[PDB]
């Protein structure tokens, strides 16, 4: 209510996850697709996902984590106070998402094969290249009955469910595995060890208008708090916040 949430990947792996998570969230944000603006927002995000998918196989590494989490969960059975009824549920959801992720076809393949999305991607690299005279097919597509568009869009988004499921569950688990430890950075500088951490979470004061500019280093790091307004904003000597290495 009065704190801002900042996250930072401590490794290239978590970096690809946070990105793929964001791009997928965007797809369903401005729905339904009614105007040209909305369409661009959609295909653009879809295109970004297809760009990161080419680089490497996100499937394997995401399965690896689903199992890693299954093991983290089972180490909590027996511990007095643990709601083991909730644990067995998660462990099954992980396995469910595991099979679903395996049985499904190559990630984003259905989107790559789509004729429409293919044409739109070509003109995203061009500043003003996604106009009507550049994308006639898209212009017609935006005049068809609203039901038809919702139909195709739903399908496009559905094809990522296997990825969306495993992804949202991995990150959700990691985010809650570690609590927020209160810290105090003086002079706008912080230095600590991350350890076996994949993610950093920071809750800064809404009124400080400051943001963490974290730098990496092996397993440790370095946070440099800077003001949104570099022309008018200040950085005090005392900065009490909340950190959490996940």
């Amino acid at each position: 209510q009065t704190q801002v949430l900042f996250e930072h990947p401590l490794n290239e792996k978590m970096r690809t996850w946070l990105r793929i998570e964001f791009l997928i969230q965007q797809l369903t944000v401005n729905l339904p697709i009614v105007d040209h603006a909305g369409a661009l927002h959609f295909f653009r995000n879809v295109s970004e996902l297809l760009d990161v998918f080419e680089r490497g196989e996100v499937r394997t590494e995401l399965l690896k984590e689903l199992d890693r989490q299954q093991r983290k969960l089972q180490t909590w059975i027996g511990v007095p106070g643990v709601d083991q009824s909730r644990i067995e549920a998660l462990i099954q959801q992980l396995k469910a998402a595991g099979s679903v992720l395996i049985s499904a076809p190559r990630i984003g393949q259905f989107l790559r094969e789509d004729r429409l999305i293919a044409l739109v991607r070509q003109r995203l690299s061009i500043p003003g290249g996604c106009c009507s005279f550049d994308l006639p097919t898209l212009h017609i597509w935006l005049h068809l009955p609203q039901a038809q568009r919702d139909s195709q869009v739903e399908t496009w988004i559905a094809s990522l469910n296997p990825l969306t499921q495993a992804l949202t569950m991995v990150l959700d688990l990691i985010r809650q595995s570690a609590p927020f430890r209160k810290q105090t950075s003086l002079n706008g500088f912080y230095q600590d060890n991350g350890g076996d951490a994949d993610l950093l979470r920071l809750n800064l004061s809404l009124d400080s208008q400051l943001y963490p500019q974290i730098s990496g280093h092996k397993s440790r790091f370095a946070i440099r708090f800077m003001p949104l307004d570099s022309e008018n904003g200040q950085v005090p000597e005392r900065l009490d916040f909340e950190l959490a290495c996940c």
Partner: peptide
């Protein structure tokens, strides 16, 4: 020992 357990794994 009991607070060392993640809040989402912590209930009855």
């Amino acid at each position: 020992d009991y607070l060392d357990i993640p809040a989402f794994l912590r209930k009855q």
